[PDB]
Amino acid sequence: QQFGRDIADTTDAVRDPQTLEILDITPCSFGGVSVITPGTNTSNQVAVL
Amino acid sequence: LPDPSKPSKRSPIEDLLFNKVTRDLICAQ
């Protein structure tokens, strides 16, 4: 086995060809950004989730 | 009635209801 796959079809692991050691692959940190605003009428201050 | 001893503070019936209803799937999605 060369490259693993999870319950979905994404690749979660790969075998190092040169060192024959297994590496878990995790896609780099990501997410959604939500902006909490009191209203531009009130203030321009925001919070970030 | 809520059960104070248990941390969730749920009733026994509520705890049974919560137990019955149920790379991870969530992680992949």
Let me know how long chain B is: 29
Give the pair of three-digit tokens for residue A10.
Answer: 């994404």
Give the pair of three-digit tokens for residue A31.
Answer: 């997410």
Alpha carbon B13 to chain centroid, angstroms: 11
Q: How was it solved?
A: cryo-EM
Distance from CA of A43 to the nearest CA of B (A): 37
Contact B29 A6 (CB under 8 A): no
The three state secondary structure string of chain A is CCEECCCCCCCCEEECCCCCCEEECCCCCCCCCCEECCCCCCCCCCEEC
CA neighbor of A8 nearest in space, from B16, B24, B15: B24
The Cα-based distances of A40 to A32, A34, A37, A43, B1 in angstroms read 22, 16, 7, 5, 46
